[PDB]
């Protein structure tokens, strides 16, 4: 039908190629994150069940863009690495010109433009990978969480999930998280984030990777024993 062409708008108003790109996201890994008052937390799922795989030489799913800005996504990694490289070059180009650290709003508009330009270019395949750009604005503690979609649009969310079983985790994000009063403490935002991941991970440790961003350009990576500690506290309420 209309999957052979791109610029054709189709009578349904939506290109079927973008919908088929969402199907790869439906089978993609689960990426969950929630931003609090003083901090933002981004979790991810990297399957360690594959045998004969060294975790030391395995690159992490969370890609460092700026000091106070990280990047998380779900989808084909071959398509994301291009988006990662184009974002990192522009990330350095921000200080190469404006001398200011990378702005979350400016970085998202660029990545959306990268999704836009390669889509508007004939004979160029668009990226069907959804990326989550989070971080704090320069000289600002207000959390900023943006997303990217294969349709070429961006939006902001307090709590958002992508990948496999995105609708199931989304129901967990609306009911158990209050935008009017986000969690103030760091432990509460991380512990509730693990509970959303335990649905798709189903009682696992090395399959969960969480990178917490702190003000004044601080990146911390929770170890395997630290992530498993939140799993034990959640299991205490289920067995009670």
């Amino acid at each position: 039908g209309y999957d052979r062409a791109l610029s054709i708008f189709s009578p349904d108003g939506h290109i079927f190629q973008v919908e088929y790109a969402l199907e790869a996201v439906k089978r993609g890994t689960c990426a969950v994150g929630v931003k609090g008052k003083n901090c933002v937390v981004l979790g991810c799922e990297r399957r360690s069940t594959l045998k004969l795989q060294d975790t030391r030489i395995t690159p992490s799913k969370v890609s460092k863009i700026d000091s106070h800005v990280v990047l998380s996504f779900s989808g084909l990694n071959a398509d994301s690495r291009i988006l990662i490289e184009k974002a990192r070059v522009e990330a350095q180009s921000h200080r190469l010109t404006l001398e200011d650290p990378v702005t979350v709003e400016y970085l998202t508009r660029y990545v959306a433009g990268v999704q836009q330009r390669y889509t508007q270019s004939g004979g160029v395949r668009p990226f069907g990978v959804s990326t989550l750009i989070a971080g704090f604005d320069p000289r600002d503690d207000e959390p900023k969480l943006y997303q990217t979609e294969p349709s070429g649009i961006y939006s902001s969310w307090s709590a958002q999930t992508i990948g496999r079983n995105s609708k199931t985790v989304r129901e967990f994000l609306e009911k158990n998280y209050d935008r009017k009063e986000p969690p103030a403490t760091v432990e509460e935002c991380v512990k509730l984030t693990v509970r959303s991941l335990l649905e798709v991970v189903q009682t696992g440790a090395k399959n969960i990777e969480i990178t917490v961003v702190k003000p004044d350009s601080d990146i911390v990576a929770l170890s395997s024993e630290e992530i498993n500690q939140y799993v034990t506290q959640i299991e205490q309420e289920k067995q009670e």
Partner: protein, 218 residues
């Protein structure tokens, strides 16, 4: 409208309702509606509602339609010319049939995209049930039926068997327990114990599905 496979989706759902409704199960093969003779299409459809049109102590059930559900554009490529005029008379018999719901017409096929928009008639059929992948709670209800007869060890509960479940809804839980009871016959015992559960489930979950759905696309 139902979706699924015979024995689970297109079978268990049809026979379970006739039990609670206290209605006689009436099965009509979808291929029998078209006899490859002109005039048998409208004749056999009117006779179905005639048996159930007196006291109406039954419900009409039709399963596994690969033929009359698709008329195509012609008498080739799986369709037939007699199917075009048969589905139209079934519409007149569906609208002309009026009761309080003692008799229902349940038809299940693979795809409804080839059906006649006339026979669809929105508002006569408000129900479209698509086959879904059950969760882990579904297996606990199927195990409880067979575990009432076959005795299980005290070290293995309903939570132990439900641990490994890969793309099986309701049909092969009985088939998996069949091998679990067959392996115990090799050890000469009538009660499956903890040593038998481990060796039996490995012979089941393995060496069955050749195609692998995996996240190594990376």
């Amino acid at each position: 409208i139902l979706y699924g496979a015979p024995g689970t989706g297109k079978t268990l759902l049809a026979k379970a309702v006739a039990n609670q409704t206290s209605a006689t199960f009436l099965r009509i093969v979808g291929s029998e509606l078209i006899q490859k003779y002109l005039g048998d299409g409208p004749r056999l459809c009117r006779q179905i509602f005639k048996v159930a049109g007196e006291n109406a102590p039954s419900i009409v059930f039709i399963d596994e339609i690969d033929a009359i559900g698709t008329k195509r554009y012609d008498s080739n490529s799986g369709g037939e010319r007699e199917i075009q005029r048969t589905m139209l008379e079934l519409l007149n018999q569906l609208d002309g049939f009026d009761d309080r719901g003692d008799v229902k017409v349940i038809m299940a096929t693979n795809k409804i995209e080839t059906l006649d928009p006339a026979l669809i008639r929105p508002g006569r059929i408000d129900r479209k049930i698509l086959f879904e992948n059950p969760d882990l709670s579904t297996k606990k209800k199927i195990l409880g039926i067979h575990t009432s007869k076959m005795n299980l060890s005290e070290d293995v509960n309903l939570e132990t068997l439900v641990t490994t479940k890969d793309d099986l809804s309701g049909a092969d839980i009985q088939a998996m327990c069949t091998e679990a009871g067959l392996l115990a016959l090799r050890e000469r015992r009538m009660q499956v114990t903890a040593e038998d559960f481990k060796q039996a489930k490995e012979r089941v979950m393995k060496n069955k599905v050749e195609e692998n759905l995996e996240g190594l696309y990376l």
